[PDB]
Amino acid sequence: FHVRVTLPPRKVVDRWNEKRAMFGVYDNIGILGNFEKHPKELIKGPIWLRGWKGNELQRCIRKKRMVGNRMFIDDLHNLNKRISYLYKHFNRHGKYR
Amino acid sequence: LRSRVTDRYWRVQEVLKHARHFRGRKNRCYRLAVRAVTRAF
């Protein structure tokens, strides 16, 4: 439980930088832009996670379906094992059934 | 997001402040202090 004996350097973070000032600018691109583009394609991230949300099993299945042929050998084997374990746990285990 | 408890010193001290006058290892060891403070209360 030994806590540190010196005060840390206080992080002087500014609330008015470029990212915090321009955060969420075009979230209403469809609403105020005569609907041409959805807020889906503003999402910067993975190929399989753009405009999609699910639990861990559906996430792993979607990853194996989109970028499954581009994953690594060990990552593909680990994802197959995770898919099998999540399938077994989600179907054959639980309380509420 | 890894979260850890930082005030654990104060967590053990809120128990150990009621057990300073005990005999044995109950005034120092936290495992033995909690059972001694509970029976005392």
């Binding site: 806590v3 540190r4 004996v5 005060l7 840390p8 | 850890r4 930082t6 005030d7 104060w10």
Partner: peptide, 26 residues
Amino acid sequence: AKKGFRAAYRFQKELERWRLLRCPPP
């Protein structure tokens, strides 16, 4: 290393208490 300012400030208060207990002020 643990991220936090509250633990550091709360230990500084205890350090001030220990210093006042060790060397009493005039």
